Amino acid sequence: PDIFNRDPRDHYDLLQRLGGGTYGEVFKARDKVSGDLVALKMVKMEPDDDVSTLQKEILILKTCRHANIVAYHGSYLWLQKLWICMEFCGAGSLQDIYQVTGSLSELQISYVCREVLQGLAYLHSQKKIHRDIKGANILINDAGEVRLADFGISAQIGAELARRLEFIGTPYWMAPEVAAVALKGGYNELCDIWSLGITAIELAELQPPLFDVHPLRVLFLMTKSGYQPPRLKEKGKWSAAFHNFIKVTLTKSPKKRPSATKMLSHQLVSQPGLNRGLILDLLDKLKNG
Ligand SMILES: Cc1c(-c2cc3cc(NC(=O)O[C@@H]4CCC[C@H]4C#N)ncc3c(N)c2F)cnc2c1NCCO2
Numbered sequence: 001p002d003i004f005n006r007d008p009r010d011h012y013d014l015l016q017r018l019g020g021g022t023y024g025e026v027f028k029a030r031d032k033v034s035g036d037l038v039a040l041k042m043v044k045m046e047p048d049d050d051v052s053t054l055q056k057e058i059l060i061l062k063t064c065r066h067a068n069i070v071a072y073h074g075s076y077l078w079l080q081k082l083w084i085c086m087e088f089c090g091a092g093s094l095q096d097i098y099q100v101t102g103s104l105s106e107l108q109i110s111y112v113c114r115e116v117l118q119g120l121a122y123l124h125s126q127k128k129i130h131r132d133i134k135g136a137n138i139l140i141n142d143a144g145e146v147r148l149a150d151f152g153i154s155a156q157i158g159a160e161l162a163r164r165l166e167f168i169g170t171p172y173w174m175a176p177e178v179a180a181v182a183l184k185g186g187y188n189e190l191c192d193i194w195s196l197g198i199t200a201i202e203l204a205e206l207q208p209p210l211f212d213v214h215p216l217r218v219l220f221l222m223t224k225s226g227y228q229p230p231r232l233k234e235k236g237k238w239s240a241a242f243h244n245f246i247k248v249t250l251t252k253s254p255k256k257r258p259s260a261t262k263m264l265s266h267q268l269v270s271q272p273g274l275n276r277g278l279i280l281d282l283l284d285k286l287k288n289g
């Protein structure tokens, strides 16, 4: 798949770090030959990370023509550092957007949900889990397209697991079911459907439920037996279809939670008037008011 064995600095000038750490090491960069902007994500590579495995995963990323996946433009591999070259989004994430525009309309939220569900459907059909659906991780490109980033690669998933090791502590005395559970980390493909439901509330209310309470307390609230799925705050403002989308996306039991494909036949994401003009409107509002 032609992973270049060259310093990406050869071809690109780094301009600005993106995300303030939440995106790891991602940069807005300018191609030197053309004038074009890109996103360069830098995944640190361990010696253990096999370069052939990588090549398998990258080819998948390269051949993707899905409309709801951030586009792959290439990748470099220089001095134990992999770089992924993607499209750059002036408008950034839906979080960057609503922090200027304010809450999205129901129709805007409905569109974002349809497009993400399409992205999720694609990921899940490749036995991939996003694991981090949220406003911050949904990019709106210059054409008003809604896209998820696909980082289904071993070295990336590897770095997340490095964090989780510091979390779960030393493993040598751990039982195999404790090791298995800790690796998985409870993440299953339907976790993305729950995360989208929270996202829709985030898009509607400018923050996820319980965001005014400390993470530690919330972790305890969440894992109480009686914990209830959150709902939208202001009843009057939203249609029954939105409330329902939320009800069904935010099902507690994963055995009873609907998949991306089933959710694409929900009232909310099937309704007329869902077009990218909704997003273009949002973009004009961001950049003007
Ligand atoms: C979303 C993400 C990205 C990621 C972020 C991107 C951001 C932008 N654009 C951007 O941030 O724009 C500024 C924000 C507003 C002002 C703008 C100025 N300068 N454009 C393209 C991006 C892109 N292709 C990506 F893959 C990289 N790694 C990640 C995650 N999620 C979590 C896991 O790791």
Ligand code: NA
Binding pocket: 087, 088, 089, 141, 142, 143
């Ligand atoms: Na673009």
